[PDB]
Amino acid sequence: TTFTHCEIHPSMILGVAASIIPFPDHNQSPRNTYQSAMGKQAMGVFLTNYNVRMDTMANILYYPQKPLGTTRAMEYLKFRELPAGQNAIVAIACYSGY
Amino acid sequence: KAIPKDQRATTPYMTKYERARILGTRALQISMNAPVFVDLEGETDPLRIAMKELAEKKIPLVIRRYLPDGSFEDWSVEELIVDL
Amino acid sequence: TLSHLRRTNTPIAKPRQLHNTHWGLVCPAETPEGQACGLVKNL
Amino acid sequence: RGNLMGKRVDFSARTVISGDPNLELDQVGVPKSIAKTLTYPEVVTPYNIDRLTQLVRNGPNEHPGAKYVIRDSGDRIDLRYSKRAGDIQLQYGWKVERHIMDNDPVLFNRQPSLHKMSMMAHRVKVIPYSTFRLNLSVTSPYNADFDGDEMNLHVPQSEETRAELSQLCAVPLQIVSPQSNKPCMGIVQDTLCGIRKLTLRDTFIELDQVLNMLYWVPDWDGVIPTPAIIKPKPLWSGKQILSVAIPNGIHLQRFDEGTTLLSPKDNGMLIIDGQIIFGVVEKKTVGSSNGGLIHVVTREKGPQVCAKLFGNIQKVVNFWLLHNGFSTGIGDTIADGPTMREITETIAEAKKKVLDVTKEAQANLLTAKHGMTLRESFEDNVVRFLNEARDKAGRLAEVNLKDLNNVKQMVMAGSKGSFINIAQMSACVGQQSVEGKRIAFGFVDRTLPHFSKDDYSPESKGFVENSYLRGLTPQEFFFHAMGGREGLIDTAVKTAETGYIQRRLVKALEDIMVHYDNTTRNSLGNVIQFIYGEDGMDAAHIEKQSLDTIGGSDAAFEKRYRVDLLNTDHTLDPSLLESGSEILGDLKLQVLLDEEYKQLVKDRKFLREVFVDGEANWPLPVNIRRIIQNAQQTFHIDHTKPSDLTIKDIVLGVKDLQENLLVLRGKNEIIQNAQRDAVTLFCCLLRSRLATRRVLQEYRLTKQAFDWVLSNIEAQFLRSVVHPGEMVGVLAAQSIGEPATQMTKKVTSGVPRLKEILNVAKNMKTPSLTVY
Amino acid sequence: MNAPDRFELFLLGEGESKLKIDPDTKAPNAVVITFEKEDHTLGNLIRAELLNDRKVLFAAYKVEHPFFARFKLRIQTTEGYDPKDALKNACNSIINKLGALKTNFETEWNLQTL
Amino acid sequence: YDRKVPSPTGEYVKEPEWVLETDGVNLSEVMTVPGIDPTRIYTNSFIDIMEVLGIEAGRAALYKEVYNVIASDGSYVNYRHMALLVDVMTTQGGLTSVTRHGFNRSNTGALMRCSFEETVEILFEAGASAELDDCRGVSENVILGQMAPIGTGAFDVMIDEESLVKYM
Amino acid sequence: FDMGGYFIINGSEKVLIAQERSAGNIVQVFKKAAPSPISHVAEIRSALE
Amino acid sequence: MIVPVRCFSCGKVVGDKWESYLNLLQEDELDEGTALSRLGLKRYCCRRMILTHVDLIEKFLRYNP
Amino acid sequence: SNTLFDDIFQVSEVDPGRYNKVCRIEAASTTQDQCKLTLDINVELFPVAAQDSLTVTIASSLTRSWRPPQAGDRSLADDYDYVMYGTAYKFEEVSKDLIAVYYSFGGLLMRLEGNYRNLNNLKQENAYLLIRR
Amino acid sequence: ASRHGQKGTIGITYRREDMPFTAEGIVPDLIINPHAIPSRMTVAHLIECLLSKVAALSGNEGDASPFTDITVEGISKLLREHGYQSRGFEVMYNGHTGKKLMAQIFFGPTYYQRLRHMVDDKIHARARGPMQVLTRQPVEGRSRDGGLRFGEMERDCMIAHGAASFLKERLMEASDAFRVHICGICGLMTVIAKLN
Amino acid sequence: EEGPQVKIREASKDNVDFILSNVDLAMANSLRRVMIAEIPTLAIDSVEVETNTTVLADEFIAHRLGLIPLQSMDIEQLEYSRDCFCEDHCDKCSVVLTLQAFGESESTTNVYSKDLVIVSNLMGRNIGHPIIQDKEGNGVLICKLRKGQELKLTCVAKKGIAKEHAKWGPAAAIEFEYDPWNKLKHTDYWYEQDSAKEWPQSKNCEYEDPPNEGDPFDYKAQADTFYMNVESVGSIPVDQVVVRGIDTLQKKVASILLALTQMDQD
Ligand SMILES: [Mg+2]
Ligand SMILES: [Zn+2]
Ligand SMILES: [Zn+2]
Ligand SMILES: [Zn+2]
């Protein structure tokens, strides 16, 4: 009955990288810590002006896709406009053992 | 000083290391066109030749087995048991 | 690029651990593995 | 440290590793480009001359080609540019620097390298694509995975060097390791998962698939086994068609909890003559286990035979599973509607039990445990209830999940996952800890600003009530994050602390090795151990064996060992041996059985002095149990007819075999007494397993069977001794170093304690006396 | 870079026969046909048809490794019957079965008005 | 604590006992206390065991301790390995540590000692003490680039003209 | 979409990384460990703005 | 950037369908799920191609040379 | 080359504990009281319920590889409804004149307890199991 | 990798015919191992998929946001409305035989990322090459066509194996090896060898 | 009629729904495989770029041009350049396509598969026509240009199969099912309470008799009757995906019979 303040949104406790993790509340703590390190090494469109700049090394994804599963926080992160991957059709199966 | 044959006390069996080194050495020599002491029954790989020579105990090599004091016992490949 | 402009360095008691005071200020997950783990904070 | 004790080298190569179910255990997939760069200098000889001339003709760009020609003169011919690269006419003694080719021995290594098994010799297999391919079962020794790992390849340049690799460090040789005297490679992942699935009673295979499964075995006799079911419809079982990979002579017995000779739950294991009789094949059977199908195969058939078995078991299993399929989904984390009610109400009651102890503590009625704060005592209780809870909730789901649960299936085979994983995923994550204690008050008297001060509730101090399937509350999420960060910190730190420990062990032991006098000495010839590991045996050649004599009642011992030819009830029945009738009342013979029994009693007291607790199972050379088993199938032992053995045949036979178990050879009291000493324990085992009553009543051995058992114990024992040259120093260092690398009353333990120990730390952290 | 040419899957190599028939040592009246620049498409088809032949005792095929488009097919027949002939008949049966399948599809398609 | 003990009937049976657990060490004193088993008394501080019960007991305690660290993590290392380490620390007559101070300060070769941790301060002292390295260590022959006197190089290989002329 | 926040020095982009330090002018009491003549210390890291 | 010709998973031409999809949304106001289905994109592999596309080309065109 | 055991039993219980296609069956001989039987059966192939009277036969024959058809013209040594082939793995001396023999039909286990068939059953890979009714 | 710390390299690439397939004609782009999931406890990966499957069919953005009232049950219900089995499983047929798999495969879209680590920028091999000036030993790094480091820990393994001659070779012939002339009186490299 | 039988359920320019009875699963599958992989098609294989002022890379565009479907009706009368006798390509073995596009408009100028023009002599055979299924009649959108954005290139289309590249894949997804009631026990249904309630009933369930619980398991039962759906991309008409698939597999088998025949000579 003492409440002085309220949280705008609890998801805001997260930084830029963790904010692309879908359902991070359903993962084991470090698996999240891993993704917020890997996404930094994921290819995609980094800036739309790529064709006008001379940088040592530039990696651009041919056909980037916005994710089917998204975070409300990505809206602000410009992620759906400038994605880091593609939605692949994925089977979790034992196949040839490869 | 060199221990007499009648006073030798090391294993009558060839060590893994000895056998690996004899095979290595013979194969090397065989490969450097040394005379082969066995019928090569079509064999061409010097290690497979070495294996064959050791199989028939026709390898003319001796193992000088050094003891921590500096002395040694010499053992012929012909006389060493190959249970490996 | 975004996460690089929100990076924090801490040079040199138990600094690497995620403190309660880090709530809402620093990301509980975005930290390196190894040597710099918990010494590189992300806003 | 960096230019002498270690240096970069030529004939080296490195790339990303990836697995292959189609490579043989001992081979390595080498990318064409890597093979086309790495070279072996081969001497022109009558044997190779023509072949070599062809690779020279082939040149540097074609695969089986060559890069250089080395003349007697010393000058190097570059086949890439020499105008005479075509018309190059070889001469005996020249060297052709030719490409690395299929079946060349090469050193393969995964860094760090805290093991002799971290560098092993493989057969080349030139393949396409830019990755080094390795057999999956060889993954474990290297400690590799395919998440982006790279591996090193070194090429020997001499016939001598090659021999060293092929003859000492080749992958099959390395299977049974001296680190823990057991196999260091076993069946993993798909093959482990598929092996359980294949070997259930339920599992039956139709003719079509049986033929493919059979043909897939590269050494298959061509014999179609008689189906376990012949009409209605011929059908084979998994057990049956897997047994084709199991070589003849292979004998195995294992009893798991509740195993009968009728194995109702398809428990334990029974393999007779390399044919499965009962039980499901999994981790305990086909993994890198002490009693293992692999341990027996390496030991019984050879390293080359066992290496073939890996490939065989996988070619069948993987093929079967390719067509059976196997998956894992969210449905596998989902637990029953009522099981979820039952779980919720388990946490609910534990939540009250905690409030009850809290109310009790706030009312000052709590009575502290001697040597603890009133608070310390309380936190202990809270933490204990909450864990009791997480586990109950877990064990609820684990039980409610059917055998069709893909997760349960992986846990059951031992391929991946444990109990806790099910528990945390399906039911409840549980209490979160940092520095052992629950989430502490980082803020003044509270864990977060969303809580009231002086809140010792589970929810305030980090108890994650929810499953991963359900999701975490922001508070649960942050506390799990704190607890999660702790592990990442030690993973990070331990890594260098653990590394340096390894170095110091190695540098202190390096110069230690077994000399030709069986003595363990350093670079000073100073004796460290008089005889290697006090027994003079190689660790690979050792196995956990039961010393029968040790335990049981004094009466039970008597029944098992005592022979009394002067008593009508305690004689050997004439059904046991032919001489049975004429043996009764032989005073002269009885003198021998008295010696026998008197020694067995002597031995019992002695072993009870060594192993004070009465522990029977000890690692000793020569698996006598297996020799008997083999004698029985080898000689088709008729458990009906009487033996052609004499009491003298047994009694003296054993007495004589003992004198032939040689570890030390010198002709003198010191060395002879030394020999007696080293052999002591093994003999107590030998005398226990080969006592007259045992041999006849139990084993039912014939004279030839016995004569053979004796020769085999001898042979095996002799093979079992350490080889002078063994660098037991480094071995020991790495055998302690490697395990330290895998390390996560309350006393300082693990990595920081090992640090205390090695440093001969004066001011230790947890000094303690244990006053009996 | 270490990637093989895509035509290597179907286009026969320099001096490389489609078939290589080698005799099985371990069993009487048994043979092993290696099919170069072929896959499951043909292997499993042939194997299944030989299974229909009564005078065929054993039939199985295996693609020893996926990087290579080739498969070994092992045929064992009753004494007097030749495995090459067994393979010949199964090959023929398949064609004749496909011939009818085409004829039947064609007839049925022509009946449709879409 | 639960203790396995032989029963009159022979079989080993659980006969648990009352045991005390300290938060500190004083060996000399607690041993001389009436009512205890001075034959059984143990301390985790092997430095104390060494000082009070001799170097032999020092070895046994040191192993016990090493063994615990491994087995606590649920790991198994064969005896011999731990035994050797324990023995090496022992042989000198005391507790020689696996540190720059302990082992690295023994009578082994100077290049050997220099390959671990003290390098230059070891080679200067090596100079003024006119040390002589007999090159039996593996370290020396590696620095020198010669075949080390280990396994494969622990013996010598000779051709015998006798046996050679015998086979032809 | 570029967000600024860096400099351009000789043509490469550069980001200043925030450096974390202990706030000054702050009174803090700490227990000085078991082997010490001094049992507790009051520290103030005084510095000008 | 720029609509993929052919769905990666099955290879049904999806190159023609882009403008048509974008039209069924502005001009027809229709929800994404119906427009995709109208265009005959039934398998989810094909659906994901259009539904999750980001036509970056249109930004790229905004720069002069 | 000939039969080794013949008797008609009556099933007391059928058990598929977690097993979907297999069942452990408990039966006793209608003739000899001393005789009992435990046996795993492919119930998906030949179904069995309790109180069913079943003729259970052994026989050492009717070696080398296995052949599939031609059995049309060949003498189907089965006047029975369900047939198995397995190995004898243990010879339990269950007191008195009583014996028990263990048979594994590629994992499908069997335990026959009786007395008389001393002059019949042997520790052989060769042992067929025939069942009718 | 997915967005769940579930990283890996390609082991093989299979064509569409070799791939397992749904009766509907759908085939995976990627096959990931069941063995990943349990030990890792990356539940959100499985949920991402289920939700993404619904999203793909429904044509609505699948909200995978953290703290929400979206349940695995909620999404399951929506997938059943689309004709698929609620827990994301789908019956698959083996690509080589066409025979139904005894198992049903968890199948659906998942957002996968392409990472900066590609095999061809990693692969490296050497066999005699550039040497340093000072030490006269192989130069460093892939970049410079360097040789790899047979370091201290590798020396140890060789010493453990008893590979005396293999070690000598690595350290000499395969790297550093040089010839000096020394004096027999003062064992120094003083000798003015005018070897010619 | 004879051996295996067909019963078409639905037809269009793009789909063939049918029932294949009196066939081996192995045969049904082998046909399914061939349709995906071994039927020849014409597709752009070389792209010579004269000018490209676009926001897209030369090869990015080049890649797309291969995925553009081309008329492969008379593909059978065109030679594989590998087998052809020229130097590179010719008429007997290729179709030459041209593409010149420019941003005249202030508005965004689009480049379509319709903007492709055949420059080679067709020998009057149905080949190389960019397949246009598009309502507005544009076909595949290759590129977008602004103002001075020019794209001038040349395409050489060649005969090929999906094994070499998936661009020569004439078929989209091929639907394939059998035994909609699991009568064969070929799958063990994963469930939570009831496999019947939990797993959706197939369309094809209607074309087969439900098992009726009060019956024993038919072990003797074998797999015949396959419910398939063949989807075309354009290159070849739906029917001809089936026919040519049947024919390719037939030819593939004939080669083996012939191989054995040549081996009999020695
Ligand atoms: Mg890894
Ligand atoms: Zn698609
Ligand atoms: Zn001099
Ligand atoms: Zn032409």
Side-chain angles (χ1 to χ4, degrees), chain D residues 711-729:
Chain D
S711 112
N712 274 273
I713 292 153
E714 206 203 332
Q716 286 173 30
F717 181 88
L718 296 151
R719 289 197 224 104
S720 286
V721 170
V722 223
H723 288 230
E726 259 270 56
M727 299 290 323
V728 292

Side-chain angles (χ1 to χ4, degrees), chain D residues 145-149, chain J residues 7:
Chain D
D145 50 32
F146 322 109
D147 65 14
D149 279 35
Chain J
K7 46 165 214 208

Side-chain angles (χ1 to χ4, degrees), chain D residues 367-374 376-381 384:
Chain D
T367 308
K369 292 129 176 178
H370 186 101
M372 241 187 285
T373 308
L374 209 65
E376 278 179 340
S377 283
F378 160 85
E379 281 281 301
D380 170 81
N381 302 313
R384 199 188 57 254

Side-chain angles (χ1 to χ4, degrees), chain I residues 92-110:
Chain I
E92 202 181 32
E93 222 281 306
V94 278
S95 88
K96 301 157 181 72
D97 293 10
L98 293 131
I99 212 83
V101 294
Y102 293 96
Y103 280 105
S104 183
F105 306 92
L108 301 195
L109 303 181
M110 194 216 200

